[PDB]
Amino acid sequence: GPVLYEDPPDQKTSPSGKSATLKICSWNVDGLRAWIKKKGLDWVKEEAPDILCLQETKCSENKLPAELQELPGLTHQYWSAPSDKEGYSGVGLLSRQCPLKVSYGIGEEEHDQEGRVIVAEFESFVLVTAYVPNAGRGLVRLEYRQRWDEAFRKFLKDLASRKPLVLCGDLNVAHEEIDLRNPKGNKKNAGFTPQERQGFGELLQAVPLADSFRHLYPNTAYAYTFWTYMMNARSKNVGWRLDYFLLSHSLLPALCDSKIRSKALGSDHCPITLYLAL
Amino acid sequence: GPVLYEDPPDQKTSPSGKSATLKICSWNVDGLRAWIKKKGLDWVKEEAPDILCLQETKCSENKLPAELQELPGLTHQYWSAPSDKEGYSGVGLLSRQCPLKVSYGIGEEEHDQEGRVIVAEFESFVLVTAYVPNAGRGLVRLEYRQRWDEAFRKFLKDLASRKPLVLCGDLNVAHEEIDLRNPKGNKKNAGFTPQERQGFGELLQAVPLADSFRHLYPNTAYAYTFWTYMMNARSKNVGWRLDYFLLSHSLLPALCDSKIRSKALGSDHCPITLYLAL
DNA sequence: CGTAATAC
DNA sequence: CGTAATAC
């Protein structure tokens, strides 16, 4: 039998003792419209997060279903979609409260053409949600992905100097061997090449950022956020951890918990939730 | 019962009496690789044409199956595919003999980015194969299609001044009501809008070119070259004539026949064959 | 390899 | 609405 993973209960109190005051939820919906048909929005209303980040929406701004506009609580909504590619990439950020400033992309024309980054600045921190480019089957985009990784790292380092940073989304890499079920087989596959894993480790050390889930559960294995639709991967928990909450070190005393909502359906990714005490 | 169409026998002698010396075949394969799996190449070897034009190949140059390189007779092969779009558009031209000159596109940067035109110049005439942009569901590209139509018309008029011209391929318009099964329903659908039909009539008169099939069969109805995969259109012969051989008037004394190979499978389009006596 | 999405 | 093709 396959070894399954049960995410531990929500810890809503920081180590300092302060109660959690902010609840961010991130989910790669892999088809915003199909995700809504599969009752994804119902799960969101059940989670009731202060902020909701979505990746791989595959939805142009004009094609957004009407129910999203009428969603309760998360009234302030921002979307980014590729200029010239239909049904590809795309992210979104939905918040209960209005952000002070909202910008798009990372400032480099080469990397801002697929709608992968939304930046939402708040009084106490800056939230970035990202959908990092996949290296592709055959590694056709691995050279581009290394260029992106370097540009994205410099971008986040500049943001982090002025304000504490929270980064979330599909970062499209399993950092370590614990972060995917079959590491020996995937050393040359997109998501686990040495170039991608190194860029991730360089990102954590340069900005600097910490992997919230791994920080709290350093030896917890079999904890994935993605399973291919093929070969019953999700039934057999043959997965990858591609979806992260990376925090600035100064927010670590405010970190309460980082969750993996393994049971939530509607995508080949599952949602992840962050609890902070600000 | 639906009214079916039987293409009359091949007339291989021109009205002047000269025997046919050139046999051009054009086919919108709508998926070059799927077309080869469906034994499309076998049909080509059975037709044995001097020149073979293909449209909507949906195949990048590096992904072309190996059997195409080893095809007998049609050894000189030229392909055009979109720069930035995978599995979209694309044409090809295969000839028994080497052409004097082979160029790509129509010379306008805006219209040469999807690989829709190949021009093959020969001693006695210039052959153009085209895959004209579809106006799209909802007519999103109808404004662009009118701009293309004007640029393409001027391009062909310049070619025709120096040499007699033969144009073939999917021109993505049913000229007249006879050219599609349900004209009253499609007046606002891509392929039969007033803008597309007028651009086609302006093309015939400006260059000038003649519709070879319609020239030879002025009152022959129910003669289509395309049927949607949906709703058993091909079984019920609910079709469109979108694929043409348009000739310069000076080649009309050399015109022997223009055929519609209704029974040839492998695509939602069927092939068309032209016989000339040069 | 499953699924969602495009284009026609 | 069928089919082929993409991207993951």
Author numbering:
A (entry chain A), B (entry chain A): 40 to 317
Give the exact sentences the study uses for this entry:
APE1 exerts its function in DNA repair through the nuclease domain which possesses both the endonuclease and the 3′–5′ exonuclease activity. As an exonuclease, APE1 digests both matched and mismatched 3′-termini of a duplex DNA with a nick, gap, or recessed (5′-overhang) structures; the matched 3′-end is involved in numerous physiologically important pathways and is more resistant to the enzyme. To reveal the molecular mechanism by which APE1 conducts terminal processing of dsDNA and distinguishes different substrate structures, we determine two crystal structures of mAPE1 complexing dsDNA products, including mAPE1 bound to a blunt-ended dsDNA and to a recessed dsDNA.
Therefore, mAPE1 still exhibits the exonuclease activity under the crystallization condition, suggesting that the necessary divalent ion may come from the E. coli host. During the long process of crystal formation (3 to 5 weeks), a trace amount of magnesium ion would be sufficient to render the observed removal of the last nucleotide. In the mAPE1 blunt-ended dsDNA structure, the omit map of the double-strand region in dsDNA can be clearly visualized and the two 3′-ends insert into the active sites of the two mAPE1 molecules. In both cases of terminal binding, a channel-like pocket is observed in the active site of mAPE1 to accommodate the leaving group. The channel is formed by Arg176 and Met269 in two separate loops, which interact in a bridge-like fashion (the RM bridge) across the active site. These three bases include the orphan base, the last nucleotide at the 5′-end of the non-scissile strand, and the last nucleotide at the 3′-end of the scissile strand.
